[PDB]
RNA sequence: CGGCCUCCGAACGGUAAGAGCCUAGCAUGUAGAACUG
RNA sequence: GUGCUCGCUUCGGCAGCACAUAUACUAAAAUUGGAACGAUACAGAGAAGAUUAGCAUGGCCCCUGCGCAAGGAUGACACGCAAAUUCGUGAAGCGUU
């Protein structure tokens with residue numbers, strides 16, 4: 134219900150969140166729609182976390198409806214935990230996860246090797262899920278603060294608005310030359326055109342800066 | 356030190372009163388020039404998002420008097436140099 | 437934002453009991469005019485009376501000096517238009533959005549330079565209290581300010597909640613009465629206020645002493661003196677108001693004539709005495725003699 | 727102290743709200759939304775209390 | 783009697799920008815309502 | 820309402836004392852009003868000859884994004900620009916003749 138309220142509060146009626154937590158477009162989107170309807174890694178991470186908990190809850194709902202078994206419930210939970218990689222799709226929004234994915238694969242190999250030793254064969258029924266379960270509980274120990282902060286940000290942008298007054302953006306790698314000139318010509322203005330004035334009316338600063346620009350082109354061309 | 360300590364912790368993060376209406380007008384009240392009231396603080400819901408849209412975007416101190424000097428004007432000699 | 441102590445509003449809007457129940461909610465809402473977020477107080481004015489709430493920016497309320505919940509003035513309880521026009525006030529209340537934000541901000545800075553006793557700005561320097569406004573004030577409390585709304589349910593018959601209905605189970609005023617359309621902005625700015633306009637047609641029906649024709653008729657006829665009126669006492673009454681040119685107290689009429697040497701004295705005196713002259717408790721009537 | 731309620735209280739509340747499309751609720755709408763920020767905590771608390779295959 | 787075994791995917795970056803009109807949505811649940819010899 | 824009075828005092832009431840103390844945006848409502856990037860329909864792309872990569876400044880302009888990153892046609896818009904000023908107008912004072 135929370136993810137739907139968010140979608141429809143954003144008015145994206147052309148999108149649909151189904152009950153296994155996949156977000157799907159319902160038609161083809163024009164450009165303005167494709168743009169307004171992109172969601173970020175906060176929304177998609179909350180989705181896939183909720184998708185994993187649903188898979189676990191419904192393994193138990195089947196056992197409680199009578200459909201499977203205690204042994205098949207255990208084996209299925211152990212499947213979920215060793216294969217969170219291809220059941221959910223969390224890694225696309227946090228590729229750091231593949232470290233937990235590789236951990237749970239390694240534990241699978243260790244446990245199967247020790248399990249299927251003698252009479253028991255290479256079939257499915259091994260459920261020892263304490264290991265992978267541990268691993269994802271530590272994953273969440275960590276991600277819970279991240280997502281609380283990210284989702285607070287997204288909701289506070291939704292309910293107050295987007296603040297552009299005092300952004301204070303950095304100078305990064307693409308703004309380095311433009312910034313150098315912004316500052317060179319701010320400094321030139323300060324320095325001469327109001328500490329050596331008596332251009333009293335206007336110190337034709339916009340023309341002294343044209344001389345500065347032409348001096349640089351002449352240097353460059355020799 | 357302690358004032359800035361307050362403000363740093365701030366920006367990181369029923370009791371009674373006596374009221375004299377000043378329009379008291381003994382016929383206005385039941386007849387008491389002083390009212391006693393307990394103010395209490397209403398609880399906020401933890402599960403609720405920022406209320407009103409402060410993204411909005413917009414009268415300073417009196418202008419300082421220019422204890423300046425008088426300017427003395429521009430010769431034509433300098434106005435050409 | 438503002439974070440304050442308590443609301444200033446008419447004692448009528450306060451209510452009947454000497455002990456009040458008021459709950460504070462910090463930054464609870466934005467002013468209906470100022471839109472500045474201000475701490476709101478909620479009060480239960482009486483049993484089965486609708487709960488009142490602080491309804492305007494603290495700065496917006498210190499500016500115009502009205503009931504910060506009832507919208508009526510704090511002195512007599514008169515709507516902005518009527519109170520101001522009777523005080524001879526033509527105020528430049530901001531209506532622009534940007535100039536309104538800037539205005540309420542600067543006015544909060546001025547109220548910050550103010551000391552919480554007198555209404556800030558020009559709103560005070562017109563303090564010649566007008567008897568028309570005084571008589572236009574409701575001298576007893578109008579606690580009808582807290583009577584509940586109508587319940588559409590019982591208005592169609594449907595309110596099966598019993599007496600637990602949060603609205604008065606009374607026949608709804610068919611909207612056409614212009615007393616129904618007083619938006620907060622209208623009642624605040626005092627523009628297109630039709631309740632106050634009916635008050636103005638009233639004030640035009642309220643009797644004053646109409647002036648006679650002849651600019652030599654400076655004879656003010658006093659009626660209703662009794663036998664306990666003294667000539668010198670009525671002289672002391674009309675004395676500082678100008679020159680009393682002659683006194684003629686008709687005891688066989690229980691009347692009198694005060695002849696004035698100044699037409700201005702006679703006019704201003706009669707107008708100040710109209711239906712308000714109280715000597716020895718007598719309801720004295722000023723008129724212009726023939 | 728704070729005393730606990732019967733389970734049908736919450737079971738009924740949630741069943742009623744169903745999926746918040748009925749217009750009756752429509753203020754829950756924004757509080758419901760505001761509770762999103764704490765949803766990764768509810769998931770963590772749910773999954774660490776999983777029921778352990780020797781129990782039904 | 784030594785052993786030695788990577789990599790696995792998502793977003794932006796291309797299919798415009800608009801002015802207008804039309805019509806559900808979406809916000810409020812308000813304040814206050816007549817006066818005489 | 821529970822209970823206790825070696826209570827009136829039967830098993831009824833009544834009495835007395837003990838304990839128990841104030842919820843609530845009171846509303847199932849009723850109005851009230853903007854928007855939906857939806858059609859429609861027009862409309863219809865920076866720099867010099869042509870085709871075109873961008874990174875900025877500015878400000879009551881915003882959108883997607885966790886974002887102090889990035890993107891949105893270089894996001895869009897900025898498009899009169901005034902001004903003093905080369906010489907005179909006149910106005911008014913302060914001194915000289």
Ligand SMILES: O=P(O)(O)O[C@H]1[C@@H](OP(=O)(O)O)[C@@H](OP(=O)(O)O)[C@@H](OP(=O)(O)O)[C@@H](OP(=O)(O)O)[C@H]1OP(=O)(O)O
Pocket residue numbers: 212215238241242245249254255256257
């Ligand atoms: O289905 P996958 O994800 O490919 O995993 C399988 C599988 O494990 P699951 O049972 O969890 O599905 C196998 O184990 P068995 O079930 O067959 O016992 C098997 O491993 P073994 O052959 O060692 O049993 C196999 O390995 P291979 O790649 O050799 O087919 C592989 O496990 P991996 O994760 O190593 O691929």
Ligand SMILES: [Mg+2]
Pocket residue numbers: none
């Ligand atoms: Mg591009």
Ligand SMILES: [Mg+2]
Pocket residue numbers: none
């Ligand atoms: Mg850009």
Ligand SMILES: [Mg+2]
Pocket residue numbers: none
């Ligand atoms: Mg730009």
